[PDB]
Design a protein around this motif. Structure first.
Motif, PDB file in Angstrom:
ATOM      1  N   UNK A 184       4.190  11.507  -3.166  1.00 21.33           N
ATOM      2  CA  UNK A 184       4.999  11.853  -4.329  1.00 21.33           C
ATOM      3  C   UNK A 184       6.293  11.114  -4.432  1.00 21.33           C
ATOM      4  N   UNK A 185       6.936  10.821  -3.303  1.00 26.36           N
ATOM      5  CA  UNK A 185       8.230  10.133  -3.269  1.00 26.36           C
ATOM      6  C   UNK A 185       8.046   8.659  -3.640  1.00 26.36           C
ATOM      7  N   UNK A 186       7.018   8.005  -3.077  1.00 26.15           N
ATOM      8  CA  UNK A 186       6.604   6.646  -3.579  1.00 26.15           C
ATOM      9  C   UNK A 186       6.418   6.559  -5.098  1.00 26.15           C
ATOM     10  N   UNK A 187       5.569   7.437  -5.698  1.00 28.95           N
ATOM     11  CA  UNK A 187       5.433   7.521  -7.185  1.00 28.95           C
ATOM     12  C   UNK A 187       6.778   7.709  -7.823  1.00 28.95           C
ATOM     13  N   UNK A 195       0.846  -1.184   0.000  1.00 23.99           N
ATOM     14  CA  UNK A 195       0.000   0.000   0.000  1.00 23.99           C
ATOM     15  C   UNK A 195       0.872   1.221   0.000  1.00 23.99           C
ATOM     16  N   UNK A 196       1.137   1.769  -1.145  1.00 24.93           N
ATOM     17  CA  UNK A 196       1.831   3.010  -1.228  1.00 24.93           C
ATOM     18  C   UNK A 196       0.844   4.100  -0.791  1.00 24.93           C
ATOM     19  N   UNK A 197       1.327   5.159  -0.172  1.00 24.97           N
ATOM     20  CA  UNK A 197       0.424   6.299   0.030  1.00 24.97           C
ATOM     21  C   UNK A 197      -0.032   6.916  -1.333  1.00 24.97           C
ATOM     22  N   UNK A 198      -1.226   7.467  -1.375  1.00 25.30           N
ATOM     23  CA  UNK A 198      -1.700   8.123  -2.575  1.00 25.30           C
ATOM     24  C   UNK A 198      -1.094   9.500  -2.770  1.00 25.30           C
ATOM     25  N   UNK A 221      10.624   2.190   3.057  1.00 26.55           N
ATOM     26  CA  UNK A 221       9.613   2.811   3.864  1.00 26.55           C
ATOM     27  C   UNK A 221       8.615   3.629   3.061  1.00 26.55           C
ATOM     28  N   UNK A 222       8.433   3.305   1.792  1.00 27.41           N
ATOM     29  CA  UNK A 222       7.612   4.060   0.904  1.00 27.41           C
ATOM     30  C   UNK A 222       6.239   3.347   0.574  1.00 27.41           C
ATOM     31  N   UNK A 223       6.005   2.245   1.266  1.00 30.83           N
ATOM     32  CA  UNK A 223       4.796   1.455   1.220  1.00 30.83           C
ATOM     33  C   UNK A 223       4.765   0.571   2.446  1.00 30.83           C
TER      34      UNK A 223
END
Length: 119
Positions: free
Chosen positions: A34-37, A24-27, A85-87
């Motif tokens: 934004x960093x996850x994307x 589950x990445x943040x939206x 730590x991005x999801x």
């Protein structure tokens, strides 16, 4: 389980939306969104070869999205987001869960290292 080719996704000649199984990445509108994307895009583009791996359960969610483990030059996107730590590791009752412990491990490493989401 087996890996299949895909290209920048184009799967068996069609574009589909893919969802990252068990993570589950943040939206886009959330902290670390934004960093996850951006982590994920770069990892995909810089990859010489992209592969999708379905699990043994449903292949699609209720939104029409591919439920898969996605691999850039043999490295799992899903896991690397989680290790960064991005999801977070997502909940699953049963079924599409074969890489659960692998992914739990990454999360643990990320959590104790206090990275991004855990901080």
């Amino acid at each position: 389980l087996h890996k299949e080719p895909a290209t920048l996704l184009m799967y068996k000649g069609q574009p589909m939306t893919f969802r990252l199984l068990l993570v589950d990445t943040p939206e886009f509108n959330e902290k670390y969104g934004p960093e996850a994307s951006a982590f994920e895009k770069k990892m995909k583009e810089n990859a010489k070869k992209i592969e999708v791996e379905f699990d043994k359960g449903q292949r699609t969610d209720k939104y029409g999205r591919g439920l898969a483990y996605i691999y850039a030059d043999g490295k799992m996107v899903n896991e690397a987001l989680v290790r960064q730590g991005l999801a977070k590791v997502a909940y699953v009752y049963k079924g599409n869960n074969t890489h659960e412990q692998l992914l739990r491990k990454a999360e643990a490493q990320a959590k104790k290292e206090k990275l991004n989401i855990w901080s």
